[PDB]
């Protein structure tokens, strides 16, 4: 299952594909990083970032603050819930106030 996910990459898959193989997986890897790919290479985020979460992204701080003002809030607020959690100093909780 370590790939099974990922597989949402550019020359690797693209739409109604790459999150068609992500409810197989539970587990997996890639959060921080295909956020930014993700979000800079064809609108996704709202579909990339509502079916992933898993622990990072929270604050900081490029994803997090950028899903907020669009449109983010429902699944925005609870990007936060595992912000304070397996975290806890500022720059990263003086941003989930912030936040």
């Given at each position: 299952?370590?790939?099974?996910?990922?597989?949402?990459?550019?020359?690797?898959?693209?739409?109604?594909?790459?999150?068609?193989?992500?409810?197989?997986?539970?587990?997996?890897?890639?959060?921080?990083?295909?956020?930014?790919?993700?979000?800079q290479k064809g609108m996704?985020?709202?579909?990339?970032?509502?079916?992933?979460?898993?622990?990072?992204?929270?604050?900081?701080?490029?994803?997090?603050?950028?899903?907020?003002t669009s449109g983010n809030?429902?699944?925005?607020?609870?990007?936060?819930?595992?912000?304070?959690?397996?975290?806890?100093?500022?720059?990263?909780?003086?941003?989930?106030?912030?936040?």
């Amino acid at each position: 299952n370590t790939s099974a996910v990922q597989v949402l990459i550019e020359h690797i898959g693209n739409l109604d594909r790459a999150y068609e193989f992500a409810e197989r997986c539970n587990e997996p890897a890639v959060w921080s990083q295909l956020a930014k790919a993700q979000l800079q290479k064809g609108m996704v985020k709202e579909a990339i970032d509502s079916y992933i979460k898993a622990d990072d992204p929270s604050s900081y701080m490029e994803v997090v603050q950028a899903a907020n003002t669009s449109g983010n809030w429902e699944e925005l607020v609870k990007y936060l819930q595992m912000a304070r959690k397996k975290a806890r100093e500022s720059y990263v909780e003086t941003e989930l106030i912030f936040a």
